[PDB]
Subunit: 295 residues, 4 copies
Amino acid sequence: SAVKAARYGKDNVRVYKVHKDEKTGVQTVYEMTVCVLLEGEIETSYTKADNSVIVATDSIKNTIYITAKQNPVTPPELFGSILGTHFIEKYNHIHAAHVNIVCHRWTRMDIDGKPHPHSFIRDSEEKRNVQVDVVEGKGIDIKSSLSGLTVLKSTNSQFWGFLRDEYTTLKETWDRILSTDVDATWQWKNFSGLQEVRSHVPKFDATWATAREVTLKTFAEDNSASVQATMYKMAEQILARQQLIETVEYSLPNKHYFEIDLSWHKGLQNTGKNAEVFAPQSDPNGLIKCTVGRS
Amino acid sequence: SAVKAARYGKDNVRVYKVHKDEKTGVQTVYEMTVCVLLEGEIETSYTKADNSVIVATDSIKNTIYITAKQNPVTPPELFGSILGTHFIEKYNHIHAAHVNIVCHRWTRMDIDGKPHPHSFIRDSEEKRNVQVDVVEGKGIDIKSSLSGLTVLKSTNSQFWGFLRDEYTTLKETWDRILSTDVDATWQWKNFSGLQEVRSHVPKFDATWATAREVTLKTFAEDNSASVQATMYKMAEQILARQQLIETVEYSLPNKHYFEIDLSWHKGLQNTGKNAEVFAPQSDPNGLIKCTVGRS
Amino acid sequence: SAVKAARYGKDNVRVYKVHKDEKTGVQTVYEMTVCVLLEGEIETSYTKADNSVIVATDSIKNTIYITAKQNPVTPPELFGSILGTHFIEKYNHIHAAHVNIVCHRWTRMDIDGKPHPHSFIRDSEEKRNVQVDVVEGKGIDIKSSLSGLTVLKSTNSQFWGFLRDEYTTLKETWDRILSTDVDATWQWKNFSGLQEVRSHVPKFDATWATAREVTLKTFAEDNSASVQATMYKMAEQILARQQLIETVEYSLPNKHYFEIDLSWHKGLQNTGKNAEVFAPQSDPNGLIKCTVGRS
Amino acid sequence: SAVKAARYGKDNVRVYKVHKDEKTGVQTVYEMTVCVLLEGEIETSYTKADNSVIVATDSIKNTIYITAKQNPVTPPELFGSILGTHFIEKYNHIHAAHVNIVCHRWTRMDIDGKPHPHSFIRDSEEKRNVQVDVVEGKGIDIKSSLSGLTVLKSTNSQFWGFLRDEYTTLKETWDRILSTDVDATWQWKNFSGLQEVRSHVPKFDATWATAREVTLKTFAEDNSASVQATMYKMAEQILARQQLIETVEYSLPNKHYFEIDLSWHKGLQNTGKNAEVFAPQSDPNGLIKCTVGRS
Ligand SMILES: O=c1[nH]c(=O)c2nn[nH]c2[nH]1
Ligand SMILES: O=c1[nH]c(=O)c2nn[nH]c2[nH]1
Ligand SMILES: O=c1[nH]c(=O)c2nn[nH]c2[nH]1
Ligand SMILES: O=c1[nH]c(=O)c2nn[nH]c2[nH]1
Ligand code: NA
Ligand code: NA
Ligand code: NA
Ligand code: NA
Ligand SMILES: [Xe]
Ligand SMILES: [Xe]
Ligand SMILES: [Xe]
Ligand SMILES: [Xe]
């Protein structure tokens, strides 16, 4: 037997960092969960009980805190690239670092119409994420994402003209509820190393903001022929607005809300044009995925 | 042996309702999870296998949808009271109904600075809840609550002057992070029945809004001596602003963020006045509760 | 305004303890999550920012570890009573301690038909729990419970003869699936203090084992007329077997498995006597509760 | 822009099936959660709103129930292969089906030392899983797995001789607790189609049982030099016992249990050889992965 692939490291490392502006007194908080996995010439720790090649996962944890102390933690694309590069430069036998970061929302509170200097609220479990793969001699690959964005529209969604056969019971519809949790990922062109990532720093926050805005606007405005059709329009627009993105991937549950026929009770009318009360279904759900790239 | 207490019913009934304004074209959605448990002369279903006294839980589920179809579902205090009253009036042998409702946020989207007519976003897992107990001949008791409101302040929290003995290791502090998930409940004076609840309908949304506003403002502005002291100030203010509330209860986790001493690494300074990077602790957590009423 | 009720303390304190038999080499592990909340003359910490009355929650955490170090942690009823008594005896102004303990399963592994001296498996998320309330001058009240025991029987469950009216669609049945998650609690007669609890130590594990055995046997053997009827038979038997229990409470979800009519597809027969494939429903669920005590 | 990749289908489809032996009266239940995603010539549903190419996800759901009705659901490797093959043979324009199945434990109850004919218990959240990819003209690729197997050993685990540098604080140890949740996957050699899968049917359950047994025995018996070293020994043995497996992958969290120094309190000794009470850490955790294949 042989080791075909191996990676190890520390997961679920929670980090908080505060920045204090001494002039204005304003404070800003960042909170993240970080995972770092390493690869390299480490096979002998598996096959010969040779621990000499192991950077302890506890040390990886220490390194994350030290790196956060000495560097900016925003945008997460930059922080992940700094953290990944550290491991491949510091340790000769480590040739790849894989860094995943989940950023948690701490939104500044407005108290009496003005921004508070040091109080924050978690407005929603929506996350901003990055995956950074730093590979010795192959540069830095970054995938940025948003997830956990839950939306619903109560009309302007249709679904008709699908294949009908002996397995089909679904009725065609020209008016339904559409609800989903959005997971969108944009993959950056490969960067040669940290200098190049630093040169593009302003594009990271701007493109996150654009991806979010395009997603919400298109969802709200499209008279949707299907989830497939609406999600394609989203990805098309993101690719048009940022030339440094190579692909956009969407993964969307279709969370079903079923009509409830109440006619058995005093002829009560609650279907089709008369539908007012629906039953949200926890499961099953549709799952629709697409990866869109350039011609 | 004897049946000392018994209640039964249907839990986790998910309901969505849409209102359509034909004039303006604006749609508004409500989504709730409802639990209804009944009590009454039902002991024989337990002791003698006498099912004749059982309103089937499936029928309770049907009743929730029918009631939602025929009545407004907002404010939840009114809807719960209508639903509870139904069971005690309809069934002679049912003498109490206990209705719990969790309201889920669907917030209207703003697209290009204007409110969208039919698209919504789940901005946070904060809930608005009600517990309604309708008891034959004893009226309607309502407890309203908000929960899942997660906040953090990065300074202006202190904790010193506590008891010190041989079990104590905690250092006194004049500057710490304070973070909590707020659970606040206000209990209404007993109402004689549905007519009285209907007469107070405007107070329900207004008092929810006041409770939320007082919580956020007090948390942001108090130079907090302890969670105990800050939470008392919140409850005091709610009671002052709404005379129909008898008690206010707060239950608050103290979610700890620990300093990380990095001095072992190149004399790096990250504690006390130099603290920038902290480790959020998933567990254990403080849990502080208070019920405040009138003199 | 006045403080009507107040309690505070530390929640989610995870504890592991190992016992090592030096003779045999056998090791035994216990793992628990503990919550301790205190009450007493602590109102001024809320109303006057007087921290002098506060035993810090961090100190409560320390006390839990110290107490576990110096005392047996099994049965949990004894450990909770020791922990609760500590606080009311140590601190003059603390008059009640409320201790909740959740015991996690670590079951000794059998390797090649023999018990391993130091390796364990988590066989199921079933918990054994205790709630201990120690109140100065009113003794020790203990409620013991099991929870998270998930069972299913595929036949020998019926449900017919229930109330039928204009809200009813449920068909009567003489053969259905019955599945539930069992939560059972037995409440002990009040104990005068720690000496009396110690005198009954052997009854705690024996009664837990009896409650579990009665639950499983009755569920498997009863040709169930309803959840109500079957749960009553369980509680009756527990009360008969242990005279020091005052009440038994069961809380049982009825987790529904629905027939699927497949007749629309090539006349496929899958209902009534022909039912083979069912759809488990995540929600809603029935919820049935009973508290049984002595004549 | 172009569609680079696309797949869609139905997730979280819960299925239960009962088998009834008319002779013996014994019943056996199977419960699964199934996900089916399809790929093929479906790009136009995304790019041109052409729904004619879409097999509705609701129809996929119907197909899962119909297939379960007409075929055995065990072993899951066979059922997944039947389900996947159905879609690629039935629909000319569908060229790949991806089927994931999670099998839930329903273990027959023993009542008074004998197996009950129709009552079952969920003994643990351990799952048996399969991933089946059926690709037109490239056969059937099956990965089988177990997950959610949580174990702990209280001694006979060491970790010393790792890299030490300026980022390292971890002390070497010759005696620690080792606890993990096991995720193990074995990948079968490619099968040409359904006939070949059927020919190997007995190997599926046998190899699952072997993988489980090897995992538990090796964990319990290895005087572990590291998680890396112990997991390699597991994979080596599985590959030796089943020649039709090409690779074995393990993914293991290292769930930390920390010593608690209590010496500050009356010189209490609770570290090193005196350690009895530990604090389980919810996060962070080590994460160690390996894929082992044949020379
Ligand atoms: O938007 C949809 N896309 C689909 O593929 C589908 N299948 N059923 N309903 C559906 N809705
Ligand atoms: O605000 C606080 N209240 C308390 O009771 C406490 N105990 N430790 N830290 C604390 N902080
Ligand atoms: O056992 C049952 N008890 C009930 O109260 C009920 N209601 N619907 N189905 C039911 N089954
Ligand atoms: O078994 C271990 N492997 C590791 O890589 C490691 N790092 N810290 N502790 C550890 N334990
Ligand atoms: Na390197
Ligand atoms: Na009545
Ligand atoms: Na006392
Ligand atoms: Na095909
Ligand atoms: Xe969408
Ligand atoms: Xe607070
Ligand atoms: Xe039951
Ligand atoms: Xe391991």
